[PDB]
Amino acid sequence: SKPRNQNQVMPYQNVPGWGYSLYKDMSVPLAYDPNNELGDLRDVFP
Amino acid sequence: SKPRNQNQVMPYQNVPGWGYSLYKDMSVPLAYDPNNELGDLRDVFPSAVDEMAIGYVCGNPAIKHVLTWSTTDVVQNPISNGDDWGVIPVGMPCYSKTIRAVTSKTEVMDPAPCEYVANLFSYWRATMCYRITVVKTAFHTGRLEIFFEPGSIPTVRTADNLGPDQTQLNGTIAPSDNNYKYILDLTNDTEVTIKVPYVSNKMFMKTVGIYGAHDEDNWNFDESFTGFLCIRPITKLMAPDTVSQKVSIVVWKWAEDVVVVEPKPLTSGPTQVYNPPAVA
Amino acid sequence: SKPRNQNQVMPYQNVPGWGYSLYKDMSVPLAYDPNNELGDLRDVFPSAVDEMAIGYVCGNPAIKHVLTWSTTDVVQNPISNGDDWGVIPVGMPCYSKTIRAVTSKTEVMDPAPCEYVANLFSYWRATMCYRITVVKTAFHTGRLEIFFEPGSIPTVRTADNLGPDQTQLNGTIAPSDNNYKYILDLTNDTEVTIKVPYVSNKMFMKTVGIYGAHDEDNWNFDESFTGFLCIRPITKLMAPDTVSQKVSIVVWKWAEDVVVVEPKPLTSGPTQVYNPPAVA
Amino acid sequence: ENTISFFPERMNNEALMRGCGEQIVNLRPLLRTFRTINDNWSLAANTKTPITDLTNTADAEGRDYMSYLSFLYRFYRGGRRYKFFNTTPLKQTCYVRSFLIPRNYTADEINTDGPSHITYPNPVHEVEVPFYSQYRKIPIASTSDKGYDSSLMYYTNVGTQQIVARAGNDFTFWMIGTPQLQGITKEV
Amino acid sequence: ENTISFFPERMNNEALMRGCGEQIVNLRPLLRTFRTINDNWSLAANTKTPITDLTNTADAEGRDYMSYLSFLYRFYRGGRRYKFFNTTPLKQTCYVRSFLIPRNYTADEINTDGPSHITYPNPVHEVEVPFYSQYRKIPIASTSDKGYDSSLMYYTNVGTQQIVARAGNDFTFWMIGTPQLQGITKEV
Amino acid sequence: SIIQFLQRPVLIDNIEIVAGTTADNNTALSRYVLDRTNPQKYIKQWTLPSTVLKAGGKAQKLANFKYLRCDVQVKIVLNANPFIAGRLYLAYSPYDDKVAPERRIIYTSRAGVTGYPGVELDFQLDNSVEMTIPYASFQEAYDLVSGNEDFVQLYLFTIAPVLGPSAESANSKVDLSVYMWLDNISLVIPTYRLNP
Question: What is the full DSSP assignment across E91-154?
């Protein structure tokens, strides 16, 4: 079925790169996995 | 207070009307209420359901054509119908088109619902419940064979239409002895509901049937049906001049366990009805 | 009622097709249903799995080349194969390319699956399960040494291709006495599955192998393999004229405990097959 | 009765699974689905039109479901749902507006003030016209009406071109046979 | 059998963790992943094309996974997923539309009316073509077909240029060996 | 009319080779194949599943049926001389005759070739080899009245030349014994139409 969107109108702003000066929330990867977590530095920096 | 939006940046795409081909999610009303639900059809359509559950409509009977049987109709030859299909193909899609030509040669069809429906879609699969019945007196008598043969058909071709080939249907070429068949002995029964399931080397079957299909575009038509039946007099009609020297037979058609695949047909021109003009 | 949107302002970016390189989140269908799930491959592919679990395919055997061994093949010298690699490198990436030149000098390869796969990716790590087997009679006899040496290789160079150097492989330079090795005594066994793990000073290894790699671009090839093996007759082939005075050996190849890093290869020109033209 | 068989209710759904996840059995959904009605309709400028002027014609053609099937029933109810895609090349500023209008009343004998919608090439108009009527349902092509039920009137700022689509909202059809169908035009 | 070893199942995953969080073992995901098929395809104006005219050619080149690997199997099933990025410099108004078409049927012998999608340079087209077929699966490059299965037909308003990508939806391939591969072109 | 039908093994072909026999049955598996005019010169080919039904003698008391689904079984036996040396490999390519040429079992490398499924054959050692090719058809079932759709080709190939003494004797030879049959069969449909 195609009911109707009683949903609200969801406002916004075109603002890109919001908070790049800040330290915490996205970017574009260029790899296979978006869960690309590496590890915790064992036997790298003693 | 006006705190700050630690919220995420929420991406998107400008894509409008996303999924209009699909069946399920908005539009703009022009009324008072967005909860404008109506009801459940009480005392509007007195029936189970006529639109959904297409087994209802696709399972709705319909008559394709009549065929005359004379005492002089050869035994084990297809009960002739001119150059057009007692040489009956099996399948839903349309095959018996004709021409209104005025040099114009525009083709038209007489599709029943069980056919009319599928010419919407691309591929199909279903059981065909035919039902054959004779018009007769009691004195009219004889035996008749119905035999089903999958696959292609011995055909004749034209630059505008196709037809069946009776020669390849003599009792010597296709005896119809072991093949799936029925024999109707008019003297004890007059109507037979023939339930033919779907059987192919293809999970589904094409729905083009016949369209832009003539001597050249014949193979699509060959590809559009699972098989073909044949009606043949096995014993001559016995009819004293006390009554007509001939009889006739009618072929009801419907379907069961029906299913379709896709809503895009297999033609080169969109669906369009032959809306009768004033004159030829 | 029409209350007011105390909701937050929800930011965004127009970014379309976000993460198409990635593997996981939409598209536009052209069918009836958005729940168009099919099934789980019953009686379609009669196998465990052929596409995922690449240990299946990467672990799929394949033959690289044959090598002839004559009674006159010197002891502890590499069983010669012209100017091309019994001087066998170890590693998945392709190394034995050849030329179709017509002045055109276009290079081609014979990569097995275990290789063909990696030429997709950039870096690799895996164990190579070779498997060597001889074709012989019982009268054919002798001993053979296989010895593995990591690192570089004594090579010869060309402006179109590279090759191995037999001189640096005499028993005096590389005795192969303590190094990892096997001795196959034809008289008691004929096939050996040599499982060589991944061992390097690099967690992973490059996948370029040989490409645009000749006398000049040689160091990439030197960097593309973990090591190299060598086959050498340790005892001469003993063969009476009752049979052939020579034998041959075959090198099956597959891999286990395999892994790859990135899907961008290490070439200067994209992947492309040598689709055989009509003629040279 | 007399009935025979040469020998299903699952093989259908099974070969469907492995071939087509769409287990379509009801058409009603296929009425909520859209389908193009006209390729590049035109429209007079800075003016308005009763959409019937177009609808009625494509209705006769059966180019879409909600007319193709219409040629198969007699009665229906529920709210239609229309869509306009803009393709006109040149404009300065582009309002596009939509009002209500009894089905077959004319633009002149009707108000231009009431429940409406407007948009700005956003190049699309996506309206749902409800079911307001006066008997209980509607004969699909009753030539005789003084605007029993409701329909759409359309206004644009400029000489305009649009792609158009239509479907049903609860929209639903009475059973009938079916007419003859037209095929190719192989004139010589 | 006879098998030896010079001495793993974790060091792999370990040096993966510290080097690469992607523990790729299955390729099926790498079929759901996209990859460019053509750099600046062109297309005739205000017209349409069966995408095969392009597909078949790039298929022979193996420039992407869903062809590279295709040269490694025989059979597959599932719904492909195509993407068009616009790069054409000049237009007035730009519809871009997409319909269905049996795999190798021609534009002329096929309808232009049916399940479709449209968009407006939003400069991108992001469609997923499903698996509708008639045997059980498909030989990857069977030269012999009267359009067994489904595929895409594409329409644009103007003489157009596009970047193109392709992948699979459940898309999946039968095992085979592999052909010879082409390298450099060092003509003299 | 009858409960159960024929799975009877039957023979197809028997080939012979001798050392120094320069021919298509030799020049074993050229490493590479560049041109379509020097393809991998094979030895023997069987278009299946037709040739089986045709020459196997099962047709008569198998015909008068249209649709079929089956898994072919095959096995090769040998009683050749020992003084020969070499090895062979058998494989099957579905629809090799119709797919793009570059995806054929021919027009590829020996490595790609052996990548295909199958099993090997030592001239001297592999006395009795067996193999089972499943229903590789994309089509649900196989037609008989047409028998036209051999959904596979079955290629034999040589790994190493027929190796032996300098100049061979007459019994210094190899011979082969093919047998093809079927398992996992299911037949349904009667039909008057007949494969010619």
Answer: -SS--EEEEEEETT--STTS-S-SS-EEE----EE-EE-----SSSSEETTBS--S--SEEEEE
The two tokens of residue D148 are 């029993």
Q: Which amino acid is at C150?
A: P
Q: Where are the alpha helices (DSSP H) in chain C?
A: 55-58, 113-118, 219-223
DSSP state of C28: E
Q: What residues contact residue C75 under an 8 Å CB cut-off, 6+ apart?
A: C171, C232, C233, C234, C235, C236
**Would an 8 Å CB–CB cutoff place C34 in contact with chain B?**
yes
Structure tokens belonging to residue B106: 């525009």
List chains touching C (3+ CB pairs under 8 A).
A, B, D, E, F
CA atoms lying within 13 Å on the CB side of residue E10: 0
* SS percent in chain C: helix, strand, coil, step 5: 5, 35, 60
Residues in chain E: 188
Interface of E with F (CB under 8 A): 60, 71, 74-75, 135-144, 174-180
Phi/psi for D45 (5° steps) reads -85, 150
Long-range Cβ pairs for the range A39-45 (8 Å, 24+): A39/E17, A39/E18, A39/E21, A41/E18, A42/E18, A44/E18
CA dihedral angle for residue D21, residue D26, residue D28, residue D29, rounded to 10 degrees:
-10
Classify strands D127-128 and B28-29 as parallel, antiparallel or unpaired: parallel
Q: Is D73 helix (H, G, I), strand (E, B) or coil?
A: strand
Cis bond leading into B233, ω under 30°? no
Which residue has tokens 């040739």? F51
Q: Which two tokens stand for residue D182?
A: 């037209």
* Residues paired with residue B107 on neighbouring β-strands, in sequence order: B99
φ and ψ of F15, to 5 deg? -120, 155
User: Do the Cβ atoms of B56 and C66 come closer than 8 Å?
Assistant: no
| Resolution, Å (one decimal) | 4.2
CA distance D125 to chain E (A): 14
Q: Identify all chain C residues contacting A33, using CB atoms and an 8 Å cutoff.
A: 22-23
Q: Is C44 on the interface with B (CB under 8 A)?
A: no
Q: Dihedrals φ, ψ of D12, to 5°?
A: -55, -60
Residue E37 identity = I
Yes or no, beta carbons of E114 and D35 under 8 Å apart: yes
Q: Does A11 touch chain C (CB under 8 A)?
A: yes
The DSSP secondary-structure symbol of B20 reads: S
This structure was determined by: cryo-EM
- Say if residues F40 and F29 touch (Cβ distance below 8 Å): yes
What does the alpha-carbon distance between residue C262 and residue C112 come to, in Å, rounded to a whole number?
A: 20
* CA distance from start to end of chain D: 51
Q: Min CA distance, B179 vs chain F (Å)?
A: 5
Distance from CA of D44 to the nearest CA of B (A): 23
DSSP letters along C85-102, please? ----EESSS---EEEE--
The residues after which chain B has a C–N gap greater than 2.5 Å are 24, 85, 102
